[PDB]
Amino acid sequence: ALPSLDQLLKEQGADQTLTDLILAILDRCGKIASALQGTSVDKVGSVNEFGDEQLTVDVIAENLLRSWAQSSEGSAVRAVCSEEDIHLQECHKNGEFILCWDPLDGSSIIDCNWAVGSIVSIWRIGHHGVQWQGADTLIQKTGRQQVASLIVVYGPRTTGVVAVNVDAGGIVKEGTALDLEMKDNGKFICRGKPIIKPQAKIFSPANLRAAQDLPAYKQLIEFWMEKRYTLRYTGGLVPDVYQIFVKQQGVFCNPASKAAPAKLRMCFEVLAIALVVEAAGGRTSNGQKSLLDVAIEHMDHRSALCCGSADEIKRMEETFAALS
Amino acid sequence: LPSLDQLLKEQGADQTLTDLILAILDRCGKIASALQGTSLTVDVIAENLLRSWAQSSEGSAVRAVCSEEDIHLQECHKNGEFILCWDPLDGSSIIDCNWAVGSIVSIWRIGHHGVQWQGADTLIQKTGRQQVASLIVVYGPRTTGVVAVNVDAGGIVKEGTALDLEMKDNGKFICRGKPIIKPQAKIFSPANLRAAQDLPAYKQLIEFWMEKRYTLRYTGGLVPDVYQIFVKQQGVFCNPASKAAPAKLRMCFEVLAIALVVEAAGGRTSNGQKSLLDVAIEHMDHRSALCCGSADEIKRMEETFAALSG
Numbered sequence: 214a215l216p217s218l219d220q221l222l223k224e225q226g227a228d229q230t231l232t233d234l235i236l237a238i239l240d241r242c243g244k245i246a247s248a249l250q251g252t253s254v255d256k257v258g259s260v261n262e263f264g265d266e267q268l269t270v271d272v273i274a275e276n277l278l279r280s281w282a283q284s285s286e287g288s289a290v291r292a293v294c295s296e297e298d299i300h301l302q303e304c305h306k307n308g309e310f311i312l313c314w315d316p317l318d319g320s321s322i323i324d325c326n327w328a329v330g331s332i333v334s335i336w337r338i339g340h341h342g343v344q345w346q347g348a349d350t351l352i353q354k355t356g357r358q359q360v361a362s363l364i365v366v367y368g369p370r371t372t373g374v375v376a377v378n379v380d381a382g383g384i385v386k387e388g389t390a391l392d393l394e395m396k397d398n399g400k401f402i403c404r405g406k407p408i409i410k411p412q413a414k415i416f417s418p419a420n421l422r423a424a425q426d427l428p429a430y431k432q433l434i435e436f437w438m439e440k441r442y443t444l445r446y447t448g449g450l451v452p453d454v455y456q457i458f459v460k461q462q463g464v465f466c467n468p469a470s471k472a473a474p475a476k477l478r479m480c481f482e483v484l485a486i487a488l489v490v491e492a493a494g495g496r497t498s499n500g501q502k503s504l505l506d507v508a509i510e511h512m513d514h515r516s517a518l519c520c521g522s523a524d525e526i527k528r529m530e531e532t533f534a535a536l537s
Numbered sequence: 538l539p540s541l542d543q544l545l546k547e548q549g550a551d552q553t554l555t556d557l558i559l560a561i562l563d564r565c566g567k568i569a570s571a572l573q574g575t576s577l578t579v580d581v582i583a584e585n586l587l588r589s590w591a592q593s594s595e596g597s598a599v600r601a602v603c604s605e606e607d608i609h610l611q612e613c614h615k616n617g618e619f620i621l622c623w624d625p626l627d628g629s630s631i632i633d634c635n636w637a638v639g640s641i642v643s644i645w646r647i648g649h650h651g652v653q654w655q656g657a658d659t660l661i662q663k664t665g666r667q668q669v670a671s672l673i674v675v676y677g678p679r680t681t682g683v684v685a686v687n688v689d690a691g692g693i694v695k696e697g698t699a700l701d702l703e704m705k706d707n708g709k710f711i712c713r714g715k716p717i718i719k720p721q722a723k724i725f726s727p728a729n730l731r732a733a734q735d736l737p738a739y740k741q742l743i744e745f746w747m748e749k750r751y752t753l754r755y756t757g758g759l760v761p762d763v764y765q766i767f768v769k770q771q772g773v774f775c776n777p778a779s780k781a782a783p784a785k786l787r788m789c790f791e792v793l794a795i796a797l798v799v800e801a802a803g804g805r806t807s808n809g810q811k812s813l814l815d816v817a818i819e820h821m822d823h824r825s826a827l828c829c830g831s832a833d834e835i836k837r838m839e840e841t842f843a844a845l846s847g
Contacts (some may be wrong), residue, residue, distance in 0.1 A: 246678070250678060250679055251705075253703060253713065254713070322765070323678075324767040324768050324769075325639060325761065325764060325768045325769065326677035326761070327637045328636045328677060328678070329678060366634075367630075368633065368635035368636055369569070370573055370635055397573050397574040407550050418753070421747065421751045421752075424747065425750065438730065441731045443630075444730050444757075445631070445755070446753055446754070448753075452635070455634060455635065456636070459633050459634045459635075499739055
């Protein structure tokens, strides 16, 4: 859409305060894009929970977002937390927003120079029943209580998706997700409003090993191959779901099995993704319900996530129910 | 740290080949910029950057060129030495998704490895062992690549001579290491997956990789899909041919260049029966299966394709 991103966000119901916050966050993501382009792969000397060597770029990315939140330019931010420190850290006593982010997602593929990304979940005190309660402010909240979310993909260019959720009843309307592109001067524009079609041609099977002790997942994967669906799976969560918006079709799956439990984080990855997906008319599921309606049990809460084309999310639930 | 100029010379390149590689890499730098500041489509912009350079006085060392867009060998400079065959911008089905994409360049040299100028048919019946060099470039958050030089008599590629590259100031690259692809793999990257549906051996190999919990990494972009093998120093990429899903990868523009860099890093390559460096070019549009990476998985693939042939 040719109108400015500022105008489009306001048309989606964001006030100037939320609009400015989103634009400021995107600007920090633009700075992460620059850091990635000029920083070599240099190990810090410590592996993450998956065993992936953390790089200097991960710390730089975290610091770019955290330093901004703590600065006077981030005065609207009450508190933040991240995958590297999951506990709320106060930034500004009079700020309104709580931010939960994954500063640089794709630790197993960043060295390969594959596309990676960032994820930001945005909550607002006094909105959707979210009141400041210190450290446990987000406990028992659901994704439907976020006021906005966004993902940013760092590839040959910088792109992303953002959605606003300001309806008092939490109604998320199809066609409210905004596809973004950063101009090389750092300014973001909106290229369109993606609508994820109910039918899919692409499949993206994450946590593939779970199929070995989860028959339903093994059978869905076999089915997708038998029907000649196109395989597209980079191992980076943000790029793997961003493709669904661009192609306006596709299914991403990351189910949980006894042997291969869910590793995706509710607060730093899943809830943000669920909002942008459902704003584009896609469906999400943990096998039972939408990821906008699953309460946060703890800040480290992990969850399965399947998302994308409605018919495939339904096929997944039906197949998991039938087998068995 | 040693310059790329120094490193290329260490691998056997003379100043002329060194300068050619640096010029090609510089043009790839400009393709990186085109991708960063553009939305003519970028694949057309990339083709034009390489073509215009080759045709200019700056490209005087280039005798002739051809590409995916125009596979016919076209003479640029009568006194040039090199023949270039390139894939300007590869990854058409994923570029819109802002996923990593790449370029591939195969380099031949008149008077070297028995390649003499024969006009349009200069490369007919030539094999990949007759290339003097090749390179791949990956456009992602950074711009990286791999280059190998093949200047020893007989064209028998030495392990540990591939140079992993990273761009700093636009168009200028440094070497980030000399990858050695281990014989054992953890990652599998199954291209042309639909071929498995009428190629039992491929289906069974994929099932095996899944059952043994190999890690799936498959972007759909040829260049990034093979580049990971160099970075991780392990992995297997497969793009086989079946009757219903034939080989689409082009020998002259994709396959031979990749085969040289992989073998220079100690990996193996195969079309199901032999190295892609030993398959004669039958036609400029010649297509071929390509499997490459960790030696043990290439061995597994060849043995399975034989046993489960149907």
